[PDB]
Structures are given as structure tokens and as C-alpha cells.
Amino acid sequence: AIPRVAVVVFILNGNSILLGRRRSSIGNSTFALPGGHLEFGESFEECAAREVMEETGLKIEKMKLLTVTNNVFKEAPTPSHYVSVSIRAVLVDPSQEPKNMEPEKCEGWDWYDWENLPKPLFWPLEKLFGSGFNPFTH
């Protein structure tokens, strides 16, 4: 029961980002970014690339730090505290399309225009966007 580090990735593709619905004890069915737990020894950029590859099959590059958010999940099966480091990234091959590589954790990935985001967003993401955060400018 300590805070744990997650990296989440904004894959900027045109005016769109990649989101998919979680299959999870936490935030089930809400739209969230690809990402996951930072491994011991791993840089943010390597973790971003690796998690995105594991979850979506996509090859990304130009990983750049955006910000960090503190996410305490009060009403969870087990009390959870995650510190979320956000990374922006772009596709290596601009023609690539995601695949749902981990259907046990995600309903599927799709591109969503920044101006037409889906709902409900995973609540840390809703709160981050509600603050005015924009990965296309930040």
C-alpha cells in the first residue's frame, strides 16, 4: 500500500488520440489511454514504448514528457494510489493501426478527435482535461 508509478501515453495522430475502454476492477468501461506500470530500472520513454507495443501493437517514437498526476482511488476493491506520468508520442509508421493485443484488459482501441472525445473518460483523465490540459500544445 504505497503509491505506484504508471506511465500513460498520448499518441498524437493528426487531431486525434488513442483511447479504449478499460476492462478492470478500476474505471471499468471508461475510456483511457494506453499505458501501464513502470518497471524497475526503466525510463519513462522505454515504458511508454513497451506498454504501447504490448497493448496496441503500435510502434511509437518522439516520446516527450507532458506532466504527472496523483490519482488516489478511494472506492476500489483494494486501496490504490497511482502516480501517472504522461508522455506524448507519435507513430513511427504513419499508416499503422492498433490491434487489441490484451482483450482481457481493454475492449478495443480507437482514434478520437480531441474535439469529439468519447464519454465516460476514466476519471483521472476527465480531471486532467477539466484542468485545461491539452497534449497538442503543452
Ligand X SMILES: CC(C)CCOP(=O)(O)OP(=O)(O)O
Annotated binding site: 51, 55
- Residue 127 corresponds to which amino acid? K
Nearer to ligand X, 5 or 14 (CB): 5
Helices (H) and strands (E) in the chain, counts: 2, 7
Helix, strand, coil percentages for the chain (3-state, nearest 5): 15, 40, 40
- Site residues for a copy of itself, 7-46, by CB under 8 A, read 38-44
- Helix (H) or strand (E) run with residue 82 in it: strand 80-91
Degrees (nearest 5) of the Cα angle 95, 128, 131?
125
Q: Please identify, among the stretches 23-31, 36-44, 118-126, 127-135, the one whose residues bind Mg ion according to the rule CB under 5 A.
A: 36-44
* 72 near a copy of itself (CB under 8 A): yes
Report the residue number, 70 or 134, with the smaller CB distance to ligand X. Answer: 70
Using CB under 8 A, list all residues that contact a copy of itself: 1-5, 38-44, 65, 67-68, 70, 72, 74, 79, 81, 83, 85
